[PDB]
Amino acid sequence: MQIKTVTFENNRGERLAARLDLPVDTQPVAYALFAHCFTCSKNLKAVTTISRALTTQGYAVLRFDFTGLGATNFEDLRAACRFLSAQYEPPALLIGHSLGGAAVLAVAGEFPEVKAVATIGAPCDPAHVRHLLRPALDTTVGEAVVDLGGRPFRIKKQFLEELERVNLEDQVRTMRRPLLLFHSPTDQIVGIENAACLFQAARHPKSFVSLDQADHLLSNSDDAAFVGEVLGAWARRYVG
């Protein structure tokens, strides 16, 4: 594995940063976009453990920090996908954790080259997102403060507005791509009922893997390794 810092712009010319994790394979089996909220934790051990499991299997992984902790919206995720399409290969796998999971599910259908989608702890609807969010104080307008049980962060109000308008369950039903949902039954932030909701909305192929006693932010790195290894093995059926 080699890790690189990358930079790219969105359609407003704003500069975004990400980390690109490359495998030993000169040609990766696939490039994955991984939109996540693990930056809410005390460290990045969860996301680097997942990413390392994927690079071990030959994937390249673009880690996109959805929290902005180092304000996000759908266009920033699209910008990351365009960056991969231009400078690498269009991503064949989308991965989303927490709010990032809701985001990748809502945009996956926009990208024909995406062959598989996987999420971790994703909420299924606006009511369960509202549980996590409150309006931020205006000065910079139109943002919200998110609480996932760790470091809080800001996002654009446009995110929930757009998510509510496109309807996540409709998007999942019409995605026409294989889906893998990970969720902990003991998740205190986004309840396990959200995974059942998403699974019922989806069409086959659809899959679900239980994270047993894991927490929302995967603070046990054994759980993060598990997610990465299973995800990589599963997606290989579809990406090549």
Author numbering: 1 to 70, 82 to 150, 153 to 253
Paper text:
Carboxylesterases (EC 3.1.1.1.) and lipases (EC 3.1.1.3) catalyse the hydrolysis and synthesis of ester bonds across a large variety of substrates. Esterases generally show promiscuous activity with a specificity for either the alcohol or acid moiety. They are members of the α/β hydrolase superfamily with most using a catalytic triad of serine, aspartic acid and histidine in the active site, where the serine residue (found in the sequence motif GxSxG), is responsible for the nucleophilic attack on the substrate. We have described seven members of a new family of serine esterases all containing a C-terminal OsmC-like domain taken from extremophilic bacteria from a wide range of ecological niches. An enzyme from the thermophilic bacterium, Rhodothermus marinus showed particularly high activity, even at low temperatures and was subjected to further kinetic characterisation and crystal structure determination.
